């Protein structure tokens, strides 16, 4: 693409610089270019990919929520007509958000997931697939909303199945997957009891395996466990 003439290693180097500079759109473009070189990604490289897009879509999601709230208020009883501009601009931001999600999903489908054989890589990418379908579901209102939700669910479920067979209950990727899938159940699938059960079971099974961990591994796992507990506190 645009990055076709730049070396893979230079794209990775520049993604790291862009991260330091908080230039996440640049970071994402560099990492897209790196993926399109066709080689598998290392652990560090997949982390750069995920950080870049998480920050780009995160900003879009926050903006969408602001605009959606304004739009909802404009449609209340007693609200003065202001014309099509709020809807148009919410639609603009939404379309940009959907485009970023489509871009990430495209990278995963061409060809990160199919070449990922190790459990850690495959689960990482399947979690991403679930996450970006979830972000599409947050803004979906038409005749494809059900199908988008089911795509998220299917990706998360495949990731869960692998993670339970192949990874310890304290593994950070496994924990973060479960955290996010639990949020999917609560916020997207209208299944708060499933959300709560998953967060609690995940937390408890991790707690029982902490004794096996080094000081540094313990720190990572406990940090994510605290996020499970925070959600449980919010929901109960």
């Amino acid at each position: 693409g645009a990055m076709g003439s730049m070396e893979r290693a230079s794209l990775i180097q520049k993604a790291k610089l862009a991260e330091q500079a908080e230039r996440y759109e640049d970071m994402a473009a560099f990492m897209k270019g790196a993926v399109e070189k066709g080689e598998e990604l290392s652990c560090e490289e997949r982390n750069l990919l995920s950080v870049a897009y998480k920050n780009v879509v995160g900003g879009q999601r926050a903006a969408w929520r602001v605009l959606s709230s304004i739009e909802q208020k404009s449609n209340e009883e007693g609200s003065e007509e202001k014309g099509p501009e709020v809807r148009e601009y919410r639609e603009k931001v939404e379309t940009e958000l959907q485009g970023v999600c489509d871009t990430v999903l495209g990278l995963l489908d061409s060809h990160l997931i199919k070449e990922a054989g190790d459990a850690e890589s495959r689960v990482f990418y399947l979690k991403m697939k679930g996450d970006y379908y979830r972000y599409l579901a947050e803004v979906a209102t038409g005749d494809d909303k059900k199908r988008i939700i089911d795509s998220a669910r299917s990706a998360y479920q495949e990731a869960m199945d692998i993670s339970k067979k192949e990874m310890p209950p304290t593994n950070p990727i496994r924990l973060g997957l479960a955290l996010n899938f639990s949020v999917f159940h609560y916020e997207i699938a209208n299944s708060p009891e499933e959300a709560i059960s998953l967060a609690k079971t995940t937390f408890d099974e991790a707690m029982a395996d902490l004794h096996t961990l080094s000081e540094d591994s313990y720190k990572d796992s406990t940090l994510i466990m605290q996020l499970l507990r925070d959600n449980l506190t919010l929901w109960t």
């Binding site: 996450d131 973060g176 955290l179 996010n180 949020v183 609560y186 916020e187 994510i224 996020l227 925070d230 959600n231 919010l234 929901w235």
Partner: peptide, 5 residues
């Protein structure tokens, strides 16, 4: 909003 990673 709830926590995700």
């Amino acid at each position: 909003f709830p926590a995700t990673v």
